[PDB]
Amino acid sequence: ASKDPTTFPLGCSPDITTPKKGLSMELYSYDFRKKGSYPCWDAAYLDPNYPRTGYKSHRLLAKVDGVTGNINFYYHATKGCTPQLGHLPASYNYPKPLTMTNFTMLLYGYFRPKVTGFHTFTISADDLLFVNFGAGNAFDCCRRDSSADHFGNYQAYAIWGSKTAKDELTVHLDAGVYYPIRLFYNNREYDGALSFTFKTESNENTVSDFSEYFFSLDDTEEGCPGLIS
Ligand SMILES: CC(=O)N[C@@H]1[C@@H](O[C@@H]2O[C@H](CO)[C@H](O)[C@H](O)[C@H]2O)[C@@H](O)[C@@H](CO)O[C@H]1O
Ligand SMILES: [Ca+2]
Ligand code: NA
Ligand code: NA
Ligand code: NA
Ligand code: NA
Ligand code: NA
Numbered sequence: 001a002s003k004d005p006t007t008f009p010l011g012c013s014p015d016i017t018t019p020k021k022g023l024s025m026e027l028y029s030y031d032f033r034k035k036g037s038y039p040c041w042d043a044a045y046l047d048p049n050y051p052r053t054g055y056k057s058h059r060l061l062a063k064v065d066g067v068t069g070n071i072n073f074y075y076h077a078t079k080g081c082t083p084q085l086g087h088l089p090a091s092y093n094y095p096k097p098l099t100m101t102n103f104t105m106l107l108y109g110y111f112r113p114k115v116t117g118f119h120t121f122t123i124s125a126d127d128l129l130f131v132n133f134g135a136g137n138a139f140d141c142c143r144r145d146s147s148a149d150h151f152g153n154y155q156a157y158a159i160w161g162s163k164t165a166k167d168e169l170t171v172h173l174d175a176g177v178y179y180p181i182r183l184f185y186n187n188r189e190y191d192g193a194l195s196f197t198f199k200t201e202s203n204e205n206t207v208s209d210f211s212e213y214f215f216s217l218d219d220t221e222e223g224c225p226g227l228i229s
Contacts, residue, residue, distance in 0.1 A: 001134065001136030002152075003151065004136075004152055005134070005137050009133055009135065011135060011226040014178055014217050015224060017217075021066060022066035022067045023181075023214045024108055025064050026062070027104070027105050028055050029059040029061060029099065029103060030045065030102045031058075032082075032083065041081075041188040045128055050186075051130055052151070055104045062096075064093050065093070068210050070209045071092065071210065072195045073088060075191060077192075081189065085097040085100065086099075086100030102188060105186070106185075107181075108138070109181060110180055110181060110216065111178070111215075112177070112212075112215055113173040113177065114175055116173065117202060118200065119170070119171055122195070123158045123196055124158050124193065125193060126191050126192055127189075129194060129196070131181070131184075132182040133181050134171070138179075139180045139182065140223060141178075141180065142224035143220075178217060181214075
């Protein structure tokens, strides 16, 4: 698939193996600058290659499976320029404290729609959430191994304090097809927040609980390109 973001993204058709519930998550540290710097937070999170290669230089905290449910959070800090502990919601399947003021997080896997039609995803973040969506744009169907670092221009992005603090992505999707998805998050300092929800043209319900929507698929030899059309 093309890497470019599109309104009609390509999806994937898994084989016999049952998709596993939830997304994969990786957590990385994101240190402050040395005492007395102005500002105190590291600006690395906005380097253009930070979401591709830069984050990998940071200390790996965790890699977990099975992230699903409601993945939204709001972490309230009490002090600027200070690492403070907190916990992710239970949905993240990570039962240890981390520096919720300052960390990087990567989620990847597949989104399976329940209805065929236009979906509008709405995102917000403190500090940053970058979203790739579709085969190629995120990664290749059951070939994430060979394509994970080759994602394309973001389908949506949100940066706290910017002219784009919230964003939307509208895409036409087919029910029961599995669409590659990559979420890249950072908190630089202080409060952190992530909101990821959607609506469809089918009804006026907002979906915030991804239990029946987020899945993981094993990579395979020849891939699992979408077979529908
Ligand atoms: C703009 C700014 O620097 N605000 C300071 C606070 O830090 C920011 O807080 C926002 C949320 O309001 C966001 O989380 C951002 O990442 C942070 O940089 C904080 O340092 C506060 C300490 O009391 O001072 C504000 O001025
Ligand atoms: Ca913040
Ligand atoms: Na097979
Ligand atoms: Na740190
Ligand atoms: Na990694
Ligand atoms: Na909007
Ligand atoms: Na409702």
